[PDB]
Amino acid sequence: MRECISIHVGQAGVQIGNACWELYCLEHGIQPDGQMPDDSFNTFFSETGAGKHVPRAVFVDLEPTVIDEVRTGTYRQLFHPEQLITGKEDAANNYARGHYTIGKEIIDLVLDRIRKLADQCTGLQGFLVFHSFGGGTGSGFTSLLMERLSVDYGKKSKLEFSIYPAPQVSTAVVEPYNSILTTHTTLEHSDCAFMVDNEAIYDICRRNLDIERPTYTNLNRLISQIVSSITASLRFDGALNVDLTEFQTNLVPYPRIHFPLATYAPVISAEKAYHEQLSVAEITNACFEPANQMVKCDPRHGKYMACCLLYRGDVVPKDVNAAIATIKTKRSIQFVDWCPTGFKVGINYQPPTVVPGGDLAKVQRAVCMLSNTTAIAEAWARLDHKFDLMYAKRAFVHWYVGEGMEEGEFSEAREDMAALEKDYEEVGVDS
Amino acid sequence: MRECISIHVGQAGVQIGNACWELYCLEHGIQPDGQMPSDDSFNTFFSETGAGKHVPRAVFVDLEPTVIDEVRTGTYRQLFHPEQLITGKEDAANNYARGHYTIGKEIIDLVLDRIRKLADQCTGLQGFLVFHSFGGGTGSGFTSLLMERLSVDYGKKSKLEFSIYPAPQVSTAVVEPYNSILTTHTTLEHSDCAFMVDNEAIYDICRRNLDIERPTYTNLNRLISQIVSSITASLRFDGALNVDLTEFQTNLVPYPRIHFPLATYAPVISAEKAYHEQLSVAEITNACFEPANQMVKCDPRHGKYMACCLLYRGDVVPKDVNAAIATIKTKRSIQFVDWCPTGFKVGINYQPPTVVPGGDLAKVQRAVCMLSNTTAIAEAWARLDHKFDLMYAKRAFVHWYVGEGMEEGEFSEAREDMAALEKDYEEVGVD
Amino acid sequence: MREIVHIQAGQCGNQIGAKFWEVISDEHGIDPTGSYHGDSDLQLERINVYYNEATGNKYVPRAILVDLEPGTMDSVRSGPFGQIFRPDNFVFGQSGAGNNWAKGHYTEGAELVDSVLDVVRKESESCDCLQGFQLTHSLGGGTGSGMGTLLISKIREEYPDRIMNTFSVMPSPKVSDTVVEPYNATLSVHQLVENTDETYSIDNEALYDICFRTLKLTTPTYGDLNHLVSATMSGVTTCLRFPGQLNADLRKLAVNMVPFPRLHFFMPGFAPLTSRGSQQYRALTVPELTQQMFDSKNMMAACDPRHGRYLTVATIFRGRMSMKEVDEQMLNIQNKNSSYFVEWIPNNVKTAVCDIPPRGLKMSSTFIGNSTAIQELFKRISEQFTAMFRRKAFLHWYTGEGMDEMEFTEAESNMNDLVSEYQQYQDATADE
Amino acid sequence: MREIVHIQAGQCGNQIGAKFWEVISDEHGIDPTGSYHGDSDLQLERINVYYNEATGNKYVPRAILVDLEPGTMDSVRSGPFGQIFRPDNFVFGQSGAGNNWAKGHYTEGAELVDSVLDVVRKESESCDCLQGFQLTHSLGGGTGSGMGTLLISKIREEYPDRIMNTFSVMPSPKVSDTVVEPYNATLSVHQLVENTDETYSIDNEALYDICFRTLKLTTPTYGDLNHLVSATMSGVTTCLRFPGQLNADLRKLAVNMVPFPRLHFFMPGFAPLTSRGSQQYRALTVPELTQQMFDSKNMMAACDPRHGRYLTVATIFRGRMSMKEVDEQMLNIQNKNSSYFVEWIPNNVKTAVCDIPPRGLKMSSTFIGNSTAIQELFKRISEQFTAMFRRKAFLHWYTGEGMDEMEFTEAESNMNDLVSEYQQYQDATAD
Amino acid sequence: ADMEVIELNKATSGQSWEVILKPPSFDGVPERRRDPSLEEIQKKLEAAEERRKYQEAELLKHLAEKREHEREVIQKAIEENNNFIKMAKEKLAQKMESNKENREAHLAAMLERLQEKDKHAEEVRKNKELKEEASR
């Protein structure tokens, strides 16, 4: 019934997956061994004859280290060994090694495992793909997998949770190249992609959680919370639900313009105790303020095309409509003229669950806004500019060419990004 | 022996029939079970069974069962045999075309078969009395279908009508003028004499003379039955005027098309009123020349008489009648056409006026019904023709008739025949 | 003309339909188990129009509950009168329509349609004298809209001589639940113009405005809107379910209300207007009930009746009142407001009085108007459609389902012809 | 990416290589017998990168010791950690190369090469996931230089997809009087430009200057110079040897460090600078490490980094310190010294922090720079080469071994093109 | 003052007579179609039934055209999805084969470069051998 298959690619994808699946288990009362003492969680967990609940997920990495931690860790009994797939050598921060050289060795094995997971689905909605833009596996292997999924599953819905690079935590100088190549190759294969800018998350952790030097553990717990909000509508039966298809219909006005901005509220430190409880109006207002955004950009300088509000906890429809109506009277929040009605609402009963010993405080109500704003084009411009700086000198290009890639692929990828920036510009113009 | 078969079509025809047959039973001393503790003339309207029971020479027809279901479950269920109460399942939905062409075709043979069985029991069949509304789809559509077939099966056998002319105070369909004109055109060459009953005239008499604030069909029908009884009294009792159906035609119809006599009845007195002195012959005769006592709204001052019949009932003496007629002629014009003599055919039927016990009418010692063929009745056709014209010019509601297989040309044909009828009334009054 | 077969499709259709069944069950004295516990023979006289009599003393709604999503069906079963429905009459899919008319009409809907028709055929073949069908749905979503109109067309094909009636809820940005409502509504209106005999235009714009402006509810909910819908649905169906002379069945109502085949979109009116919480109220006389006919504030469609002309009107008065006073007050309103009634349809206003008032009120009035002002509702939808269509916004979700742009152009063109047709009769004169 | 295969060729190669093995064995807690006696799991996590695990608790360096002269082998076996090496991995000739690159590359070296490849193939085929090779040698002599580069080409032919890394010691007239060193260095640089992926330029000119000027050692010995080499070698391999995110393997390091294939010559830097076996009891601070590590006085190549621009930089901090302080200090240095970093390679400085400090220090910093200033080292060699070549001095030493003058002209031309290429990127602008 | 009374009939429960007030000013009494036929009636009722049946058939012909269009849209979506699969499959096979070709070409070029170095080395060895032994 209404299943969703999750695929976690490379270090970022796998580590975010660890945080997501840990949180889902806490939310549904599933123990680390798959045992549990609603019914909707079945969209994400299959059940065995022994009453054990197994994630509908595949974890893939070209190197074994990160997944080796999953198969030796707390949740080793949660996943069956066949759904944790590892090669021997990674893509060395090279898209070409991920997509071709190293990736072509494990691709058939990964598709064989997803095929076995899809065979256990009676109402497959599609795929949720988690990966970074920057790594050789997250960039190259993801694009290879995305193309192969379009072949085997045609138009079946494919949504991404993509980690947008930040220099504070970056491991490769070539991340802008890997980001542009994966974006060009995946564009026609993805229906909707939720970018998460590592700098935005890094700044929220520093500013809101008082973490001097945020680690991936800090970043991923916060990321896990946003993912869980986007997926709670599928994993629970609440006051107002929103499925995979409804997300595309309500957030994607044109096939290429498929990158919603996520904004989460409230993010409160595990100290204080006075900094709550925030009202529905207060948390909704916080969604339109730039500090709570998952991607760094300025919406005041852009136009909204679609807005989806996903509430969780002690939230009533009357409270929500009151908050959306005040947002409607706000001159500083502008919507495109070709959009008479821009709001889509999800409401779930369960307050946001926090990982014991985590940085986040327990809140009575939270919200995740997904908005398609032309302001997100600023994130593409910053990436495109870093690409241009290096590409003008062909700096590092030889590493990709050595793996059989052609310079023409770089030009093609960059021209497609230029057309994407041009599309965001055209979409924001009035008729 | 000279038998008359009564045919009650649709709700109005059936409900008026209930009131008429209830009154006939009271007049002849027939109980609701058909028993009578027995001047032989009542046999023209009632046949006799082997069990000594008296059965109306009547057929009740409806395209829906509700109204007749009341007759077969009511006080007079033993008066009628089941075979003379004929119903379909679905009505004509106030659509002449539906009553005539669609549904009517399903029950016509069955009705004629029942009529034929009643005619087989007659030794001197005079003809048919047909009771129906102009406004309903059955009353309009089924009646004209039946009248045409009766002319085929009983060539040159008398057919008289008691037709309910529509009034907006009690109307149930906006399309009543269409149905009225369609039925009038189709029935014209098949009817020998028709007594129209304008629901507004009856409604006004009930309000004014009977002090009924909001008259119901029960109030209207009791009053209608009194006039029907006045007209049929000399067929059902050994009278001297209108002794046979052929005599109505001879006495009132000088040209085949101008066959719509005007009925004027008096006195109509409230039962729930203070003891009063009985009205004399002069007073009731004077009431015959008052437009307020008419069964159709029209102005006899705007027309010319071509025949006048005075039907007295009860304690009436010829000397008092002649003196009353002599005084009227001195004060009033009472203008006849060039070719007709200025006069009256008078009939006294000694049988007392009868009222339903617990009804709205007071029992009176003497009453009178004047039947006059005046050109003023053309005013009733003009009012109907004008409402037809208003809607027809826009083809409003026409699609409902066309949808049943009627042609638009039938509306034009029916209206042209009404225009020729208005022209006939004008041409007849000229000199 | 006895039985009506009721169909409830999608979230809105099921929510409004469930409210209709609880309001009418209370009026007919039926409890949530199906047992009659009333104290009036009038309540049972025409019970068979909406209810089947099952084994023993029980009455079962002749209702089919449809959705592409299971959740709504659960919510109905869990509702106050949830257990009254036939369990086999709940027909639901497992994957919703994603607020996409094309998924409801061509893909997911088409896959569920035969399971629905089998249930409607079972109910229809059991009928002694089937009047036709009554569908409750929204036009803004995917299921009620796309699948609802697919059902209408499939039903028209199998029962071409039966009356097709709808309670169609029109979308509004004021209380919206999807960005593509203008597309879904226009594609549905195109279907309704061609395939229904009579449609009650229930406008969320008008319901929101009544709650906010008249009822002084700062933040109206679907609960507040649905309280006006259920009062309207009870009022407009009074003549079908209680004994009476006027518009006693679906065909006689259509013959009196529909002068031109495409002009079958009714503007409902209701008085007195009340809020769920307003359990006061002590008021309303016959002249007061009548005045609300021309009152735009009492219209369930966001159109001003004084901006057009009435082709035909059905007025239903409920409670203990003088039929004389009603006749006088109704004649006065027509004579005084002559200019808002077409002169070429004489006696175009028909009045009915039912002794049984609805619950909570001692006196009420329901208006059913076929007004040329309904063109304002269609123009509002057309302008919102055009603002999106001009830029081909969200169009890939429809063409992705196999649809062509031409269907959008055709639906828009047909709706604009409907507007042009209303305007033609608005300007027509009895120059005759 | 696990195993690295280490090769030590000639006197300098073996002396610096032996020092590397004693320094890294102490860091990983390995004694001269091969037994682990440390007290930290971090020491063994990546032990397999440089050591094979032999029968029992013993760890054996994956090291091959090569010389055309036997004496050095004896000196290595007699050294502190001499017994740790695999006896079969010592491959020694009897003749020597007499400071002649041609003898090492074409003659005597070619006669010993197959015996070396026997041993390298055995070590390589035993690898689960071979990263590649690390060669230590001088460029000024005959074996390390000529035979070392011959080994590079032979190994590359059999392992073309593995990383080739060198620690190449550049000659200086300050430490060696051998007149032919510029020829041997130029002939070797020509080989390195074409056949290695990454080369650490360890300059005897800079080592001598540090010992004389900073350490105040009037007459430095190879022991004094080698102490700076071993501190550098420990520092630059820290990321390969301990768990971490940055430059964790030879390929990821090359991808981050090498923007153009030929420009793979690194300028290493270290802080604090110390003399042999000397205390201590005053650890440098983070701002001090950050400043000192980017100073001309701390560079292991005799080039002023302020005379060029950094293409890419890897900075490694070792010891217990604040990662926040390191991030601030590192950002400050690149914002303040903006002009010494190319603007067309964004975020070209990558920082790593390892908790384990080297022995004798509580805090240390190692810098790996790809700087355009390294052209000063190549120009110094080229000027010394030309002064000799212009007069064809000592040419018969090389032509006597079968070489032609053209190889000298080609090597010189290739090295001058490398200088011209560094200058081109030094002058390039982002614009 | 003038009135002519003509007695008409006398019966058990009635009496009738004619009262003449004035004779007709115009003397000479006043100043049609058949029948109809059952066949004529049947022909008209049958013609109306054929019109009703013809229009119901036209409504059905149009509803069947809608069913045909419904199948055509379902088919169009199947075809577009199938062509999408076919397009992605060929683009991917071309990209993987082109990349294979280029990578093997780069590996061949570098091994050939190293092989030429070996040829040069044996030629160097030859020269040393011409110099050594064959002198002194």
Ligand SMILES: Nc1nc2c(ncn2[C@@H]2O[C@H](COP(=O)(O)OP(=O)(O)OP(=O)(O)O)[C@@H](O)[C@H]2O)c(=O)[nH]1
């Ligand atoms: N938010 C977040 N980002 C991560 C995490 N791990 C790595 N990244 C980011 O993702 C990028 C590095 O890509 P990775 O996912 O580590 O590399 P990979 O997909 O494994 O690809 P290869 O190692 O080159 O085969 C840099 O931007 C990192 O900052 C993580 O756990 N959380």
Ligand SMILES: Nc1nc2c(ncn2[C@@H]2O[C@H](COP(=O)(O)OP(=O)(O)OP(=O)(O)O)[C@@H](O)[C@H]2O)c(=O)[nH]1
């Ligand atoms: N006087 C009188 N008029 C009636 C009565 N019933 C209906 N009418 C009038 O007749 C017209 C309606 O026609 P009906 O006789 O009810 O309809 P029907 O003949 O049964 O035809 P359908 O129902 O359309 O099949 C309106 O003018 C009514 O006012 C009645 O009992 N008495």
Ligand SMILES: Nc1nc2c(ncn2[C@@H]2O[C@H](COP(=O)(O)OP(=O)(O)OP(=O)(O)O)[C@@H](O)[C@H]2O)c(=O)[nH]1
């Ligand atoms: N830093 C350092 N340099 C050295 C050492 N030993 C020799 N050198 C330098 O290395 C170069 C001399 O080359 P060698 O390593 O002795 O030559 P080789 O590889 O043994 O080759 P041949 O003796 O000619 O067969 C000169 O630049 C010396 O300064 C040492 O231990 N440390």
Ligand SMILES: Nc1nc2c(ncn2[C@@H]2O[C@H](COP(=O)(O)OP(=O)(O)O)[C@@H](O)[C@H]2O)c(=O)[nH]1
């Ligand atoms: N009046 C009213 N409108 C509703 C209700 N629920 C949803 N709607 C409206 O219906 C449209 C959304 O369609 P909906 O029926 O929920 O989608 P569906 O389940 O695909 O048919 C929008 O115009 C919503 O405002 C309700 O309970 N009452």
Ligand SMILES: [Mg+2]
């Ligand atoms: Mg990785």
Ligand SMILES: [Mg+2]
């Ligand atoms: Mg009827």
Ligand SMILES: [Mg+2]
């Ligand atoms: Mg030596």
